[PDB]
């Protein structure tokens, strides 16, 4: 009935509350460069350094068995997964940029 659902405001509404009553902790980047060669363990090898990936979700054709080009990262550090993004975001690895962002932006 109730409960408010609205995200179109580019920004501010998420955080609105002065103590922040959640989020901030742990946080998920998109990945886009896998081009049918890119695993699991590359992407974290490089990610790693920064500091710890919790669990790797790809995004690929089940039905063939092959990787589509992107995929979700689990960082359990915020500020370590945004640095992470903050860097990768534009490197190239298997001769192809790395597409990383932060998933949500203009969802509503």
């Known amino acids: 009935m109730g409960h408010h ?3 179109h405001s580019h920004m ?3 955080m609105a509350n002065n ?3 959640g ?6 980047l998109y990945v886009g ?3 049918f060669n890119i695993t699991e363990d590359m992407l974290r090898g490089i990610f790693e350094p920064f500091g710890r990936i919790e669990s790797i979700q790809l995004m690929m054709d089940s039905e063939t068995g092959r990787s589509k080009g992107y995929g979700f990262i ?3 550090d ?3 997964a945004k640095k992470a993004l903050e860097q990768l975001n534009g490197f190239e690895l298997a001769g192809r940029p790395m ?7 203009r969802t509503d």
């Open 5 to 7: 659902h609205h995200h």
């Open 12 to 14: 501010a509404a998420a």
């Open 19 to 21: 103590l922040q009553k």
């Open 23 to 28: 989020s901030a902790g742990p946080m998920r």
């Open 33 to 35: 460069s896998l081009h």
């Open 74 to 76: 689990t960082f359990s």
């Open 78 to 80: 915020s500020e370590c």
């Open 99 to 105: 597409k990383v962002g932060h998933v949500t932006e």
